[PDB]
Design a protein around this ligand. Structure first.
Ligand SMILES: O=C(O)CCC(=O)C(=O)O
Ligand SMILES: O=C(O)CCC(=O)C(=O)O
Ligand SMILES: [Cu+2]
Ligand SMILES: [Cu+2]
Lengths: 312, 312
């Protein structure tokens, strides 16, 4: 342990997906299914975006889910006011990208102090945008000063270019300065194919929370996908992962979102793709007959799917 | 540098894709386009598989490509004989997965010695299957003893479960025992979402050759995809990558293979997916107007595609 939780962002980052147009009912359906699956947090679009985004946050936060519903806002006093009024259980602050550090620290602590005052039970996370490309002394100076006032700090690979040893190194340094009590969240884009690998390295370095979306939908090619992330963690912590989540629901989660946003599940999609458990080579087929574990990273039945043998 | 080459395996690993059924002409088309693109090696199915696979290897090796054509066989004398007779420029040996090490070394060196004798100009690579899960002392003992007799050794994450720091560590240890002259190849499956990240870590650790396939097609959910790998390497070595390959051909490569194997390019596919350069968030759109580099990991025009702004 290696203890960690997932923050699903399908109703925040996922809304930024090109073809996403979630009705209030779509969002409630998604949130209930995630809650059934056992997701620990559900993050939703800032209530400042539109009157409908506000309403959606208000409903989602009041559904009586076991998952904590949290909203994502700019690190500003005016947004924070709207946020607390929605009744969310958490607020995820993003400090957006030659300006002095004490001031940045002062600005952040002001917003955070407002929240503690207006709603002492709401969990507060603070992230700086584009965390891995920020100059590191100043980044750590800000995180060190803000951490005693927040429940969680986050790191965001905003443009999807962080590398895995880079993520590992910077998460370790953050954990050093913020200490053991403060949680650590990782959000990573998939532009260079490293979202799942980077989330895994973040956890190895001490991160406690990983952002995912169903099918990885999000801005551009999106972020760490739920299924791919669970495949990665299952092979390392099968007992933990199987206990935490209803893994056999993964195909229904992926189908639901694919249907709503108007895409096909990629042919090679982790676990649920057409091809994820297809075997063809003679020597592979030979071994799978004695033991399918021979060429399978995890059992298809765990995730509610089946293998295919191409003996043709 | 950070010098490296790509071994495309679309005509070997890619043939193991569930829906692959390449005619001889499909393979020639693919090989010529890869050669135009500037791929350094093209790996093809063992000639032992069928009379048609033999013929295909014979044709491909004789196309007069600038790329070296190499075939992939079991580490056996009988296969090696068929292999040399095809005229390929390289042979990629795979030693397939409580049996003693001197014997394994003897068996391998016998096959390798046959090749040197029968065809001294053919490049020989040796890999042990499932390299990252093999007990490491014995694995290094075999690689150390075989390396002086081969041009290249390879490591294969056969079941797609290696982790990035694991790949980095084992490539470094292999480089230690084989020395600087012997090349090092990485082949990684994508079952846990780490194929691109693991190939990148392999190169950082000293690997010189990475196996890819177009769209990552292959057994199960396949291997490191060409486009995703190039996106990852471009952000780190833009000058090198742009000089090495005709990057604007990537959409045609992905389209060609998707058409042949009967799949759609995934909606979120690296670079060439419907969604790879779609922007939606207001603050993102705001910044992209001043500078698209603000939320883009690489320029779409480099790879012959265009961005999308969802201002709606
Ligand atoms: O608040 C965060 O950590 C993530 C914000 C975001 O979507 C990004 O920077 O990519
Ligand atoms: O020869 C190799 O390195 C790769 C063989 C293969 O496809 C695998 O082990 O996954
Ligand atoms: Cu994001
Ligand atoms: Cu393979």
């Amino acid at each position: 342990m290696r203890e960690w939780k997932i923050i699903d962002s399908t109703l925040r980052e996922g809304e930024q997906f090109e073809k996403a147009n979630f009705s209030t009912q779509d969002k409630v359906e998604i949130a209930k299914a995630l809650d059934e699956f056992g997701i620990e947090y559900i993050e939703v679009t800032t209530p400042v975006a539109s009157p409908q985004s506000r309403k959606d946050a208000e409903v989602l936060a009041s559904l009586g889910l076991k998952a904590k519903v949290v909203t994502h806002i700019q690190c500003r006093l005016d947004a924070a006011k709207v946020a607390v009024e929605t009744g969310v259980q958490g607020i995820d602050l993003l400090f957006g990208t030659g300006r002095d550090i004490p001031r940045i620290i002062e600005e952040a602590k002001e917003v955070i102090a407002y929240i503690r005052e207006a709603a002492p039970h709401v969990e507060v996370r603070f992230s700086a945008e584009d965390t891995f490309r920020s100059e590191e002394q100043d980044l750590l100076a800000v995180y060190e000063a803000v951490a005693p006032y927040v429940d969680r700090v986050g790191l965001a690979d905003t443009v999807g270019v962080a590398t895995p040893r880079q993520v590992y190194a910077l998460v370790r340094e953050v954990r050093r300065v913020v200490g053991p009590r403060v949680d650590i969240e990782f959000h990573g884009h998939n532009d260079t194919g490293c979202a799942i690998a980077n989330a895994y390295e973040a956890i190895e370095a001490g991160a406690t929370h990983v952002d995912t979306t169903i099918l990885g939908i999000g801005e551009r090619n999106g972020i760490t996908p739920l299924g791919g992330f669970l495949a990665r963690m299952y092979t390392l912590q099968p007992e933990y992962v199987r206990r935490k989540y209803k893994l056999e629901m993964l195909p229904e989660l992926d189908r639901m979102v694919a249907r709503m946003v108007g895409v096909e599940i990629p042919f090679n999609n982790y676990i649920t793709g057409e091809t994820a458990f297809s075997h063809k080579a003679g020597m592979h087929l030979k071994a799978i007959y004695i033991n399918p574990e021979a060429y399978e990273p995890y059992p298809p039945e765990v995730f509610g799917v089946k293998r295919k043998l191409i003996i043709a």
